[PDB]
Design a protein around this ligand. Sequence first.
Ligand SMILES: *[C@@H]1O[C@H](CO)[C@@H](O[C@@H]2O[C@H](CO)[C@@H](O[C@@H]3O[C@H](CO)[C@@H](O)[C@H](O)[C@@H]3O)[C@H](O)[C@H]2NC(C)=O)[C@H](O)[C@H]1NC(C)=O
Ligand SMILES: *[C@@H]1O[C@H](CO)[C@@H](O[C@@H]2O[C@H](CO)[C@@H](O[C@@H]3O[C@H](CO)[C@@H](O)[C@H](O)[C@@H]3O)[C@H](O)[C@H]2NC(C)=O)[C@H](O)[C@H]1NC(C)=O
Ligand SMILES: *[C@@H]1O[C@H](CO)[C@@H](O[C@@H]2O[C@H](CO)[C@@H](O)[C@H](O)[C@H]2NC(C)=O)[C@H](O)[C@H]1NC(C)=O
Ligand SMILES: *[C@@H]1O[C@H](CO)[C@@H](O[C@@H]2O[C@H](CO)[C@@H](O)[C@H](O)[C@H]2NC(C)=O)[C@H](O)[C@H]1NC(C)=O
Ligand SMILES: *[C@@H]1O[C@H](CO)[C@@H](O)[C@H](O)[C@H]1NC(C)=O
Lengths: 374, 374, 374, 374
Amino acid sequence: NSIQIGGLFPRGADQEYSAFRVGMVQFSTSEFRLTPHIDNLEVANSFAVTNAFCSQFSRGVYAIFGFYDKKSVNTITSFCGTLHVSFITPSFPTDGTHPFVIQMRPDLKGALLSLIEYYQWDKFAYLYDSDRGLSTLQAVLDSAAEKKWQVTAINVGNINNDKKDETYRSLFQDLELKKERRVILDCERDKVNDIVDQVITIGKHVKGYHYIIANLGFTDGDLLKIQFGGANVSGFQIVDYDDSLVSKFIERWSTLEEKEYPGAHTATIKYTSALTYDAVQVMTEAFRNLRKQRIEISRRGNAGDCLANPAVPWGQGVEIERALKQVQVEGLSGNIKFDQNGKRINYTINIMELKTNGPRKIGYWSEVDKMVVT
Amino acid sequence: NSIQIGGLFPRGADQEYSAFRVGMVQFSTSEFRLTPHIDNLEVANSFAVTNAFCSQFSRGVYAIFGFYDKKSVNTITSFCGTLHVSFITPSFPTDGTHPFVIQMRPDLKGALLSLIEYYQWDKFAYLYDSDRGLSTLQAVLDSAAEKKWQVTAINVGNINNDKKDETYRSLFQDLELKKERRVILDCERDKVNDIVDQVITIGKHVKGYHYIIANLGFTDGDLLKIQFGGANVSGFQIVDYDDSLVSKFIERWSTLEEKEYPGAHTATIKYTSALTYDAVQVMTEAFRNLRKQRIEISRRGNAGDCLANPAVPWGQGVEIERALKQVQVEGLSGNIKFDQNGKRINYTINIMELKTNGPRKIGYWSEVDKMVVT
Amino acid sequence: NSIQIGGLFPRGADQEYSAFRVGMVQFSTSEFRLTPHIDNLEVANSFAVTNAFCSQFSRGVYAIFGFYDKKSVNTITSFCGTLHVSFITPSFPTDGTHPFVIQMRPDLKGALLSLIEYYQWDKFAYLYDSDRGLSTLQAVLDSAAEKKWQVTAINVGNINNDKKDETYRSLFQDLELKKERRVILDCERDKVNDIVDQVITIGKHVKGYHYIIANLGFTDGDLLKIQFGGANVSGFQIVDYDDSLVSKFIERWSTLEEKEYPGAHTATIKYTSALTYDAVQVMTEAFRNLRKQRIEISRRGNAGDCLANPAVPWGQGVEIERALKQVQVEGLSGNIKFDQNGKRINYTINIMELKTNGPRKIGYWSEVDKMVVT
Amino acid sequence: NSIQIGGLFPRGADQEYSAFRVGMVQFSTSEFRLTPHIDNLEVANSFAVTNAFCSQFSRGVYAIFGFYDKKSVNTITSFCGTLHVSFITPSFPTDGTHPFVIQMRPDLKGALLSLIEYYQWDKFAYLYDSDRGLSTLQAVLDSAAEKKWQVTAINVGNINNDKKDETYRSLFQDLELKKERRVILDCERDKVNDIVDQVITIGKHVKGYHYIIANLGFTDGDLLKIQFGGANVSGFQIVDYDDSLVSKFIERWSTLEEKEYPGAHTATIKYTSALTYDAVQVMTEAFRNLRKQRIEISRRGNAGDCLANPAVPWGQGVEIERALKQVQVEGLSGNIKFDQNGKRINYTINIMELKTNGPRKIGYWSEVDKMVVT
Ligand SMILES: *[C@@H]1O[C@H](CO)[C@@H](O[C@@H]2O[C@H](CO)[C@@H](O[C@@H]3O[C@H](CO)[C@@H](O)[C@H](O)[C@@H]3O)[C@H](O)[C@H]2NC(C)=O)[C@H](O)[C@H]1NC(C)=O
Ligand SMILES: *[C@@H]1O[C@H](CO)[C@@H](O[C@@H]2O[C@H](CO)[C@@H](O[C@@H]3O[C@H](CO)[C@@H](O)[C@H](O)[C@@H]3O)[C@H](O)[C@H]2NC(C)=O)[C@H](O)[C@H]1NC(C)=O
Ligand SMILES: *[C@@H]1O[C@H](CO)[C@@H](O[C@@H]2O[C@H](CO)[C@@H](O)[C@H](O)[C@H]2NC(C)=O)[C@H](O)[C@H]1NC(C)=O
Ligand SMILES: *[C@@H]1O[C@H](CO)[C@@H](O[C@@H]2O[C@H](CO)[C@@H](O)[C@H](O)[C@H]2NC(C)=O)[C@H](O)[C@H]1NC(C)=O
Ligand SMILES: *[C@@H]1O[C@H](CO)[C@@H](O)[C@H](O)[C@H]1NC(C)=O
């Protein structure tokens, strides 16, 4: 009744760690407690990721929570699938079916295509970033080929910031050659903030221009900066701030202090932090299910090292995976239900549009049902 | 005075190993000799790749030669950068800059864009495969954005060996429906062979079609099947069989036997194995230059541990990298010279066409000079 | 009882011999058994054919089964007519009336002419091989002279196999220069396979061309390579694979231990082998009927030599011939009925084309009724 | 000393036999006198032909002379090739190379094609019979395909004489309405005589009709019937009546009597008879050369039975073949010389076109040069 888990967090991650500890203290069952081993590192460094994973495996950790990017996803997936260690992450889902990886970030390709069809778009620009994967870009290109679209895929992830002014000015001047008024911003948070800021400077945020933020976090950024101007702005939001549970959680979250809980005294929580909260919840739920199933998973610092030749797995790993992937709970992100691969199934995505008054949801998207209008 | 190096090879790259051994015996001794440690492994498995790298590092190898895949390149780059151990490879160049990696494959984006400009194409399909990366697809996407092209990018990678015929057939009927005669194949040898077989079966290799084989191995595939069809078949070739060095090497190499040297009894040699030969030459020349400079590189003791904390790299790694990047030799691929990032500069790619009498070179593409017609 | 027969199988006809053995072991009963003398020989050698015929006559056989070509048909027919010994064959029917020769192959000239009239052709080519024969070419030339057609007869039997690629390529180039779109392939299985391979290689199987495989073995050749090209490919088939008897035959034929029965472990049976099986059936039926007629068919070793001077035949062979020509049974080729001259009558030939979903029987041809469309 | 030879003659070749005996008595030398054993049989009967051949072979005969038909050429050539026995014939050349056979009849396809080219023919009818093979038919069809001729080939051998009136009228009316004014008669002497008799009866010999008789016996048939008909008639001839040797032979032939020399009391002889005479001459010359070369091909005992398994070859037969294939003597049919295969070369064919004063040689044809006009 003393489960030791592992935690990998980026060097500079505060809100996600705060949500992690909030969930841990919220779901601290009197039957058992989860003791985490938190490692802060540069996730982009595959060597550092491997070092942390190997140290946690040597320490005897049953389940590992962490993050990965395009430069550190393959190593994590391979190590987990070989050593039979369950990995729970809020990061982007891997392209394919990688075992022993629990992916709680819902896919956005289907919702993005459904929203594009709803908006009746034929020609548009697609500004993407290579720091998260090109699966969305490939899906957009395939849909464009199928439905006879004219998509201009432009990468904005390979430019610095000192020459950003001139580079993006040239990019937008080239975009105005075709009179492009509809663009999609499939970029990270800092990248999309740069896009919106430089759009404001260049003066292309006037009416007629349509912008789509291709991420689950729409209300986290400076929506007020481009709120005025009359330009269409649309996006997605996994979290429903109007839900009773979300409001109850956010009240306590705002009442928490900032010293011991960095990035907490605010009325907006990042979707990564929300997914970390549901990750804590699902970990506790799976371990309660394992305890109630009367299954012995006794393990300690005796499994061995990381680079054992041959690397023999342990039989409890497949049972831990079955327990993790066979739960159905509800959190900030909504209904949670994974498949045999480790991806959510019956999730719901709330679509919001930005107006002068403020952000406002226009409908919801699901798997069985396409975009719905209220 | 023996120098120990490492070797990573995929399970199936027999011709590459044969070319490695041929280069080893050719450049056997001038003032010393090399001692490679070969470790055949699944190159796409990041865990196995890490295990091989760590075993070779513990063995105390001065340099490492091996391949990598799109899902195993980050591990090599990170480990080599953090351990100051060079990695000479004939695989696809990395998307960016990475120290301690000596990439031997010349870039193809510039030559492909120059060939498209020379052919004056406005609506060309792009059948890409997710093995060597999507960097060329991205580059052609920005080029299309900046040159007003109609690119129909289609992924032909995520298909199994059970509906290949149906998938390729339906793809080509779709291409006929939008009436698209210009197609670019950015796939490897086996994939382009499958595509060529399918297009022959459906009967679209007749006059009125144009295909570009976007790989350095234009003649490595079986072009005799589409030689008499009547459609343009362009491509790029890195080895010139009419060159003195290549002709002498082929005369020495075709007389061998397929028992001790698998895949070494043919008049043609794959560009990957050619780059293996030139990589053996480059390593030999670099170590010869190091010996001539009288720099002490021998270890003072054991190499250490792969996952040691902190990862301390030896002071001779920078010297090894500089010596490897400072060599300028002539090989099968042509002039060999590396810049500060480990890429290849001052190279030449011969553009060739498949006429009814055989593949005939029509010109060459350099970095300082664009496509030249001869 | 024990009745001995002869066998003139060629050197290389493994499937026909396997079908012969299967027919023997299936139609053999306790009433009597058949003892064959199988001699493998170069059937184009009239000397060897005469030697084998003389030896089998010297044994004292009652009927002879085997094959012949255009270079050995006259000697076989003359020997059988002079010696009053019957000869059942699946080879091409003789161009005339010949007694004591039972021919299991139905005529194709009438069906071919009816199909040409149905397709309403005016200017078409006719690729013939002198090795198979020229009776069909003579018939089509006479019809063209009587119906104002433009037939371009081409011989393809004189091409040596050492360089039989440029010959076909130049031939089809000449056909293109003559604007020839419709071609009739009247050749053997190997020759038609080579012609189809060359056609696909030169890209002459696309929509706009028409091909008629003028032989009863439409599906025996590898038709899948040209199925998806898009050009019309018609032909004739004598064996109906959807019939109950044929399906029951294949149910056993596909599981016949190919090592023990060469050319049997397949779902496709050559029309020649099917005719051999039906010939075994008809000879067994004829001998059973002769035994059930209370006729003395006792013959001892009094045959002597085949070149007796004068050559006095044995009168017991005319009853054998009458019984053989008085057989009305069903089989793989369909209804079997022989006229006074031994040529097959009351037969149906299935006319099929090659579609994307496989060959389909669109109708049947008969002597009494012209081509019928379904 | 003497050499036994064999003679195969059809039932009715009385003048052929008379010419053979005239040649024998004229070329009888005191050094050795041959003793031919003449056999009379239906040459179309393959069984009789091979029985006579085997009787000769058992007799111990070194060289065989005789005729063969379309239905016996194959067996004759096969037996001669297998038993290494030389065969000398005046019949049609074999449709292809065949060892141990001497063809004394010069080819006609080249001369006929040259005459057609010189006569500026682009549309005609090729009336042929299947008696001398289809080599000429194949040659004219290939030449028509090459030179864009609209030739209509009609077979007349299969049509029964009783019913060959209504069909004759129908086909001639078809030719008249289609302006098929030019015809070619590649038929035997009797068939062409019947054809010209029918033409005279029907009155289709009006000005414009250009009949070509494709045989060497132009003057053999009745040409005075169409001498004053006003219709062009062109033929070929191998024996020149103006030569001194031919004139002396025809005088010594006409001075003979019809009692002991049937059909020898006229001034008109057949080209086949002339070829028989030249065959006797070449046989005598070859035997004289063999005797002079001090080569004894004498056999101690009987050759045995032809049906012996295995066969019984002998190198003296090969030496005899080499002796025959290296003879260059003149004769009634002109110069005689054989190539390596056995065909006759170094020959000239005299072309005559019928006029009101009778046949007159309008030129000659050879192989070292095209057709020549005098
Ligand atoms: C392959 O087979 C198809 C059969 O579906 C051929 O289609 C044929 O196309 C011709 C076009 O000239 C049709 O002839 C036309 O018939 C109509 C109605 O009788 C008439 O009004 C036109 O003037 C013309 O004569 C023909 O009917 C049609 N076949 C059938 C069965 O309907 C196609 O041509 C074939 N491919 C080749 C290369 O021959
Ligand atoms: C029958 O024999 C007579 C006797 O020569 C032929 O008369 C002449 O034949 C020549 C060719 O042998 C003809 O020359 C041709 O003339 C045409 C123009 O009409 C020209 O285009 C050709 O290139 C060629 O030079 C010639 O006209 C013809 N008549 C005369 C008066 O000289 C005759 O052609 C033969 N055939 C028939 C069916 O009569
Ligand atoms: C921005 O949003 C507005 C309203 O939400 C859109 O306005 C209408 O959109 C419908 C949907 O296709 C069109 O049929 C109408 O013609 C639009 N009317 C007007 C006055 O715009 C608008 O299309 C959206 N996009 C842009 C670029 O403005
Ligand atoms: C295949 O090659 C031929 C000839 O190299 C191309 O034909 C040329 O097409 C261009 C179109 O840009 C015309 O301007 C030229 O006149 C054509 N002929 C020549 C000799 O250049 C053809 O376009 C190529 N592609 C295909 C699909 O056929
Ligand atoms: C032809 O064969 C069929 C099937 O065996 C039979 O029904 C039909 O009566 C036969 N025709 C004649 C004329 O006997």
